[PDB]
Amino acid sequence: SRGTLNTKRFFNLDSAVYRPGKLDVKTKELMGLVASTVLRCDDCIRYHLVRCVQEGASDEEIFEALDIALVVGGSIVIPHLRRAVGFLEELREMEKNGETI
Amino acid sequence: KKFVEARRELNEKVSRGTLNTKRFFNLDSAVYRPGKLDVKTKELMGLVASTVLRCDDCIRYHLVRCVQEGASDEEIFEALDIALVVGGSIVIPHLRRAVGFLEELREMEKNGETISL
Amino acid sequence: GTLNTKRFFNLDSAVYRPGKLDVKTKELMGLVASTVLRCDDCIRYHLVRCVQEGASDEEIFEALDIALVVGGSIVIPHLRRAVGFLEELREMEKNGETIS
Amino acid sequence: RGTLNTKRFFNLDSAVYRPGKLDVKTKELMGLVASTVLRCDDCIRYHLVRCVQEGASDEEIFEALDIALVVGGSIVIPHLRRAVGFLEELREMEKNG
Amino acid sequence: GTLNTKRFFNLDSAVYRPGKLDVKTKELMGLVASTVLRCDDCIRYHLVRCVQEGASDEEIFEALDIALVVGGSIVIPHLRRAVGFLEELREMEKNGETISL
Amino acid sequence: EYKKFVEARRELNEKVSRGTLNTKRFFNLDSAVYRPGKLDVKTKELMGLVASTVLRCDDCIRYHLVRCVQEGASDEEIFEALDIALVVGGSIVIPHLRRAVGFLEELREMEKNGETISL
């Protein structure tokens, strides 16, 4: 009803490339974060931030990743970076209140 | 060879440019120094960003650094796969070049020729 | 704007008028370009036009799949929104409402 | 929030628009052009405010936006529409104080 | 590469197979996408396929005009290259030289 | 390389022979938006340079550098513009900024040598 078999296979491949191999899942989700930030996709950034938090990334790990995206992608990324840090703070508050992420 | 030479010459000039240009280049270096993320990981992140943004010289630079910091071909390829799926088939020409360059770096390693910048 | 702005807007309209390529084809091209460049308002515009010119959901989906593979999984949020807007258009159609 | 590197980068972003051989109005117009071709609404809004503060006329702004339009393609049109809407807002504020 | 790399390449081929849109049309769409995204090797690939599938120069130019207007004057160097390459393919066609990938 | 740049531009415009009316209109608009108005030509060409740099188009960068030099821009003015492009567009701009500086050096050497800079 929505899309084709090719669409479905592509979405599946997008999930698959973030599964752990020689690189662990936290590392791959941090890479997804970096790519999503330099390409300036807010929904993608939010998805990978959630995953990073779920996989036990620290705020400092996330910040150091975001800094690489900022330098590579330029000051044009700043509004997205700002939104990312704000969303991370919401996630940490949920954690402190015992809400499932 | 050339790649290395041209990088040095650029940093030599960045005499020319401004204080702001110098400051930028210094930050570009700084953000890959070790923190809670180790330098291998940061250099792999640089590789991913460089690849999705389709900058061949950037790709080359971060491939060198990833090899220097002990990343395996399998680690590199897992990172390049994320870049490929996220950035699309337009990434393919860059991936092809990345793999050619990695093979050259591995041949240098095989022969004891130090991978330097 | 200026005289230049008007001239540019006029060219943007003109390039989708049919020639050896028919209008459905050109509007589907507009949709593909809009999707890989991730412009929601552009996507919406060309979706309306594709529907107006008789494109089927399948033709639209086949085009969106090219944009997805060429442009990468970074386009997924826009593709999702494209399909949602198409469904809205189809529902308008079934309710006897005009796609203008 | 962030690191010392983040702070330094934000500082550098401010610094590059300080006057030199190019005046601040010119530099802010360049930021406007860059922000428009790159399709960043928050960036466009920022540099519009600065352009207005530095005395740029609507005609100056329009001539800059035309460059961004041609360079960046018709894909920039939604952003150009929003820029102009926001410029009109700033001019109304100017009229009213 | 990996199984995921292989799957991605398989999907890249698959999305151009005939459906309700014919292959000529799909390859022209590939051309437009490749051009606005300024990938020269991708443009060359799709030009070869367009030519192989019987597109005319006028059809190709109408497509390139969409990409030019949508993607901007930054596209011009790529359009120049595309037209040079197309002229090479037409010379091959004139000369009865098989065009194959 | 400057000479190569000039001849390829020449041949393309000659070819835009095969352009549709739409292609020709677009090219004319591309020239028109840099003609002076309330903003002067040096300013508009410096904007073209900034836009071309953050979008990472080498031939476009080269074209606007020629025009900036022709219109009497200084290296300092050009570098202040390129710094905006670098910060905004990120370190992926660096390879292009390197090429830009190299090309500017070639133009300055032509100028020193009394060699006409033309397109």
GROMACS .gro file of N, CA and C in nm, chain D:
model
  291
  319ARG      N    1   2.711   2.164   2.876
  319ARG     CA    2   2.679   2.148   2.731
  319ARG      C    3   2.806   2.165   2.647
  320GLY      N    4   2.838   2.066   2.565
  320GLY     CA    5   2.955   2.074   2.479
  320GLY      C    6   3.087   2.068   2.553
  321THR      N    7   3.192   2.111   2.484
  321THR     CA    8   3.328   2.106   2.531
  321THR      C    9   3.389   2.242   2.508
  322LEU      N   10   3.516   2.256   2.547
  322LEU     CA   11   3.590   2.378   2.516
  322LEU      C   12   3.601   2.400   2.365
  323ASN      N   13   3.608   2.290   2.290
  323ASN     CA   14   3.612   2.301   2.144
  323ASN      C   15   3.483   2.362   2.087
  324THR      N   16   3.370   2.322   2.144
  324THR     CA   17   3.241   2.375   2.099
  324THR      C   18   3.242   2.527   2.119
  325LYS      N   19   3.286   2.569   2.237
  325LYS     CA   20   3.290   2.712   2.269
  325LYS      C   21   3.379   2.790   2.176
  326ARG      N   22   3.497   2.736   2.153
  326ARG     CA   23   3.591   2.799   2.061
  326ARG      C   24   3.532   2.812   1.920
  327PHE      N   25   3.458   2.711   1.875
  327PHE     CA   26   3.399   2.714   1.742
  327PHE      C   27   3.292   2.822   1.732
  328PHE      N   28   3.208   2.833   1.836
  328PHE     CA   29   3.104   2.934   1.839
  328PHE      C   30   3.169   3.071   1.841
  329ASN      N   31   3.280   3.084   1.912
  329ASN     CA   32   3.351   3.213   1.917
  329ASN      C   33   3.406   3.253   1.780
  330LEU      N   34   3.460   3.155   1.709
  330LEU     CA   35   3.514   3.174   1.572
  330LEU      C   36   3.405   3.215   1.473
  331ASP      N   37   3.287   3.154   1.487
  331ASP     CA   38   3.171   3.191   1.405
  331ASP      C   39   3.132   3.338   1.422
  332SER      N   40   3.140   3.390   1.544
  332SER     CA   41   3.114   3.533   1.566
  332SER      C   42   3.226   3.618   1.508
  333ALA      N   43   3.349   3.572   1.526
  333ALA     CA   44   3.466   3.652   1.493
  333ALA      C   45   3.475   3.678   1.344
  334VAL      N   46   3.433   3.582   1.261
  334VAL     CA   47   3.456   3.598   1.116
  334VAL      C   48   3.368   3.703   1.053
  335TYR      N   49   3.268   3.752   1.127
  335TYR     CA   50   3.180   3.858   1.079
  335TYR      C   51   3.216   3.995   1.137
  336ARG      N   52   3.324   4.004   1.216
  336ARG     CA   53   3.373   4.133   1.263
  336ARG      C   54   3.440   4.207   1.148
  337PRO      N   55   3.435   4.340   1.150
  337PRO     CA   56   3.483   4.417   1.036
  337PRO      C   57   3.633   4.406   1.016
  338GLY      N   58   3.673   4.412   0.889
  338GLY     CA   59   3.812   4.419   0.852
  338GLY      C   60   3.820   4.511   0.732
  339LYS      N   61   3.887   4.464   0.627
  339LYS     CA   62   3.887   4.534   0.499
  339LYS      C   63   3.747   4.529   0.437
  340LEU      N   64   3.669   4.426   0.468
  340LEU     CA   65   3.528   4.424   0.436
  340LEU      C   66   3.453   4.475   0.557
  341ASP      N   67   3.352   4.559   0.535
  341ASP     CA   68   3.278   4.615   0.647
  341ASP      C   69   3.175   4.515   0.698
  342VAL      N   70   3.122   4.544   0.816
  342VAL     CA   71   3.028   4.448   0.876
  342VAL      C   72   2.900   4.428   0.793
  343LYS      N   73   2.847   4.532   0.730
  343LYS     CA   74   2.731   4.512   0.643
  343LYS      C   75   2.758   4.413   0.532
  344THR      N   76   2.872   4.428   0.466
  344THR     CA   77   2.911   4.335   0.362
  344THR      C   78   2.923   4.190   0.410
  345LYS      N   79   2.987   4.175   0.526
  345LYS     CA   80   3.007   4.041   0.581
  345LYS      C   81   2.876   3.978   0.619
  346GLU      N   82   2.784   4.057   0.676
  346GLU     CA   83   2.653   3.999   0.714
  346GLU      C   84   2.571   3.960   0.588
  347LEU      N   85   2.582   4.040   0.482
  347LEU     CA   86   2.522   4.003   0.355
  347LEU      C   87   2.580   3.876   0.299
  348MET      N   88   2.712   3.856   0.315
  348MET     CA   89   2.771   3.728   0.277
  348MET      C   90   2.721   3.611   0.359
  349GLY      N   91   2.705   3.631   0.489
  349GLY     CA   92   2.644   3.529   0.573
  349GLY      C   93   2.502   3.497   0.528
  350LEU      N   94   2.427   3.601   0.491
  350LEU     CA   95   2.294   3.580   0.435
  350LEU      C   96   2.296   3.493   0.308
  351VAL      N   97   2.382   3.528   0.215
  351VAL     CA   98   2.395   3.449   0.093
  351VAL      C   99   2.429   3.302   0.126
  352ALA      N  100   2.532   3.279   0.207
  352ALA     CA  101   2.574   3.145   0.245
  352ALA      C  102   2.463   3.066   0.311
  353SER      N  103   2.396   3.133   0.405
  353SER     CA  104   2.286   3.069   0.478
  353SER      C  105   2.171   3.033   0.386
  354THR      N  106   2.143   3.117   0.286
  354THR     CA  107   2.035   3.089   0.192
  354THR      C  108   2.067   2.976   0.094
  355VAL      N  109   2.185   2.979   0.032
  355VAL     CA  110   2.217   2.866  -0.055
  355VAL      C  111   2.222   2.729   0.014
  356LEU      N  112   2.257   2.734   0.145
  356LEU     CA  113   2.264   2.617   0.228
  356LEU      C  114   2.133   2.584   0.296
  357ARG      N  115   2.034   2.670   0.283
  357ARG     CA  116   1.897   2.640   0.321
  357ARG      C  117   1.883   2.616   0.471
  358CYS      N  118   1.941   2.708   0.548
  358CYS     CA  119   1.927   2.707   0.696
  358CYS      C  120   1.841   2.825   0.741
  359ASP      N  121   1.716   2.798   0.777
  359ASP     CA  122   1.624   2.906   0.815
  359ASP      C  123   1.666   2.989   0.935
  360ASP      N  124   1.718   2.924   1.039
  360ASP     CA  125   1.758   2.998   1.158
  360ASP      C  126   1.877   3.087   1.125
  361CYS      N  127   1.967   3.038   1.037
  361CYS     CA  128   2.083   3.116   0.996
  361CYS      C  129   2.041   3.236   0.912
  362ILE      N  130   1.947   3.213   0.820
  362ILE     CA  131   1.894   3.320   0.736
  362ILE      C  132   1.835   3.431   0.825
  363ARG      N  133   1.752   3.390   0.921
  363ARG     CA  134   1.687   3.485   1.013
  363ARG      C  135   1.788   3.570   1.090
  364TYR      N  136   1.891   3.505   1.143
  364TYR     CA  137   1.998   3.572   1.215
  364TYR      C  138   2.064   3.679   1.129
  365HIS      N  139   2.108   3.640   1.009
  365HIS     CA  140   2.181   3.734   0.922
  365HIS      C  141   2.091   3.842   0.865
  366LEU      N  142   1.963   3.814   0.843
  366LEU     CA  143   1.869   3.922   0.810
  366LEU      C  144   1.863   4.027   0.919
  367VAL      N  145   1.846   3.985   1.044
  367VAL     CA  146   1.844   4.081   1.155
  367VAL      C  147   1.971   4.166   1.155
  368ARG      N  148   2.086   4.102   1.139
  368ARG     CA  149   2.212   4.173   1.139
  368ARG      C  150   2.222   4.269   1.021
  369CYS      N  151   2.182   4.223   0.902
  369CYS     CA  152   2.180   4.313   0.785
  369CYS      C  153   2.097   4.440   0.810
  370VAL      N  154   1.980   4.423   0.869
  370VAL     CA  155   1.891   4.534   0.900
  370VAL      C  156   1.955   4.625   1.004
  371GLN      N  157   2.010   4.566   1.109
  371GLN     CA  158   2.082   4.644   1.211
  371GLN      C  159   2.197   4.726   1.153
  372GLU      N  160   2.268   4.670   1.054
  372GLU     CA  161   2.384   4.737   0.993
  372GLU      C  162   2.346   4.831   0.878
  373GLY      N  163   2.217   4.859   0.862
  373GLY     CA  164   2.168   4.956   0.765
  373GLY      C  165   2.146   4.911   0.621
  374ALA      N  166   2.142   4.781   0.596
  374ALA     CA  167   2.116   4.734   0.461
  374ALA      C  168   1.973   4.768   0.420
  375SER      N  169   1.954   4.809   0.295
  375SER     CA  170   1.823   4.840   0.240
  375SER      C  171   1.758   4.711   0.191
  376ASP      N  172   1.626   4.715   0.171
  376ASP     CA  173   1.558   4.599   0.112
  376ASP      C  174   1.620   4.564  -0.023
  377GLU      N  175   1.651   4.667  -0.105
  377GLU     CA  176   1.705   4.643  -0.240
  377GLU      C  177   1.840   4.573  -0.235
  378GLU      N  178   1.927   4.614  -0.144
  378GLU     CA  179   2.054   4.544  -0.120
  378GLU      C  180   2.033   4.398  -0.081
  379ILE      N  181   1.941   4.374   0.011
  379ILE     CA  182   1.911   4.238   0.054
  379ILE      C  183   1.856   4.154  -0.062
  380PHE      N  184   1.763   4.210  -0.139
  380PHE     CA  185   1.707   4.141  -0.254
  380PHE      C  186   1.814   4.107  -0.357
  381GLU      N  187   1.904   4.199  -0.383
  381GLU     CA  188   2.009   4.168  -0.482
  381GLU      C  189   2.098   4.055  -0.434
  382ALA      N  190   2.126   4.048  -0.303
  382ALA     CA  191   2.202   3.936  -0.245
  382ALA      C  192   2.122   3.805  -0.255
  383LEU      N  193   1.995   3.810  -0.220
  383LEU     CA  194   1.911   3.689  -0.225
  383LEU      C  195   1.898   3.638  -0.367
  384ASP      N  196   1.899   3.727  -0.467
  384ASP     CA  197   1.896   3.681  -0.607
  384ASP      C  198   2.018   3.600  -0.645
  385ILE      N  199   2.133   3.641  -0.594
  385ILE     CA  200   2.254   3.558  -0.615
  385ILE      C  201   2.236   3.419  -0.554
  386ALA      N  202   2.187   3.411  -0.431
  386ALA     CA  203   2.167   3.281  -0.364
  386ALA      C  204   2.065   3.196  -0.445
  387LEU      N  205   1.961   3.260  -0.497
  387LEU     CA  206   1.861   3.190  -0.577
  387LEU      C  207   1.920   3.120  -0.702
  388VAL      N  208   1.992   3.197  -0.781
  388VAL     CA  209   2.054   3.145  -0.904
  388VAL      C  210   2.163   3.040  -0.878
  389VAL      N  211   2.247   3.065  -0.779
  389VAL     CA  212   2.350   2.974  -0.744
  389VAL      C  213   2.296   2.842  -0.687
  390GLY      N  214   2.201   2.855  -0.594
  390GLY     CA  215   2.148   2.744  -0.517
  390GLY      C  216   2.030   2.672  -0.575
  391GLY      N  217   1.967   2.733  -0.675
  391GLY     CA  218   1.860   2.670  -0.749
  391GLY      C  219   1.724   2.700  -0.694
  392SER      N  220   1.625   2.660  -0.772
  392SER     CA  221   1.487   2.680  -0.735
  392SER      C  222   1.448   2.607  -0.609
  393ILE      N  223   1.528   2.509  -0.570
  393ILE     CA  224   1.512   2.444  -0.443
  393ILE      C  225   1.518   2.542  -0.322
  394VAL      N  226   1.583   2.658  -0.338
  394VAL     CA  227   1.590   2.760  -0.232
  394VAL      C  228   1.462   2.845  -0.218
  395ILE      N  229   1.369   2.832  -0.312
  395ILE     CA  230   1.251   2.920  -0.314
  395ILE      C  231   1.169   2.923  -0.183
  396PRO      N  232   1.137   2.809  -0.122
  396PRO     CA  233   1.064   2.813   0.007
  396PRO      C  234   1.137   2.899   0.114
  397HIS      N  235   1.269   2.893   0.114
  397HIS     CA  236   1.350   2.969   0.207
  397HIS      C  237   1.351   3.115   0.176
  398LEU      N  238   1.354   3.148   0.048
  398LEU     CA  239   1.352   3.287   0.005
  398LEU      C  240   1.218   3.348   0.043
  399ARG      N  241   1.110   3.274   0.021
  399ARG     CA  242   0.978   3.320   0.063
  399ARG      C  243   0.969   3.353   0.214
  400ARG      N  244   1.022   3.265   0.297
  400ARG     CA  245   1.027   3.288   0.440
  400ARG      C  246   1.117   3.407   0.480
  401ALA      N  247   1.230   3.423   0.412
  401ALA     CA  248   1.323   3.534   0.438
  401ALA      C  249   1.251   3.668   0.419
  402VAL      N  250   1.183   3.678   0.306
  402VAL     CA  251   1.113   3.801   0.272
  402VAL      C  252   1.002   3.829   0.373
  403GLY      N  253   0.927   3.726   0.410
  403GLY     CA  254   0.824   3.741   0.512
  403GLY      C  255   0.880   3.796   0.642
  404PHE      N  256   0.998   3.749   0.679
  404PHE     CA  257   1.061   3.786   0.805
  404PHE      C  258   1.118   3.926   0.795
  405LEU      N  259   1.177   3.960   0.681
  405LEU     CA  260   1.221   4.098   0.655
  405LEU      C  261   1.107   4.199   0.672
  406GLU      N  262   0.990   4.165   0.618
  406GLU     CA  263   0.873   4.252   0.633
  406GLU      C  264   0.835   4.269   0.779
  407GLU      N  265   0.848   4.162   0.856
  407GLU     CA  266   0.825   4.169   1.001
  407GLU      C  267   0.920   4.270   1.068
  408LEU      N  268   1.049   4.263   1.034
  408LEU     CA  269   1.150   4.351   1.093
  408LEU      C  270   1.127   4.497   1.057
  409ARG      N  271   1.086   4.521   0.933
  409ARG     CA  272   1.054   4.656   0.886
  409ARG      C  273   0.931   4.713   0.957
  410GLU      N  274   0.836   4.626   0.988
  410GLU     CA  275   0.718   4.673   1.063
  410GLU      C  276   0.758   4.713   1.206
  411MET      N  277   0.844   4.632   1.267
  411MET     CA  278   0.903   4.663   1.398
  411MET      C  279   0.978   4.795   1.397
  412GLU      N  280   1.055   4.816   1.291
  412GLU     CA  281   1.130   4.939   1.271
  412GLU      C  282   1.037   5.060   1.265
  413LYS      N  283   0.930   5.047   1.186
  413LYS     CA  284   0.827   5.150   1.173
  413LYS      C  285   0.763   5.183   1.308
  414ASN      N  286   0.738   5.079   1.388
  414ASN     CA  287   0.670   5.095   1.516
  414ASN      C  288   0.763   5.124   1.635
  415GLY      N  289   0.895   5.122   1.614
  415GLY     CA  290   0.993   5.131   1.724
  415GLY      C  291   1.062   4.998   1.754
   0.00000   0.00000   0.00000
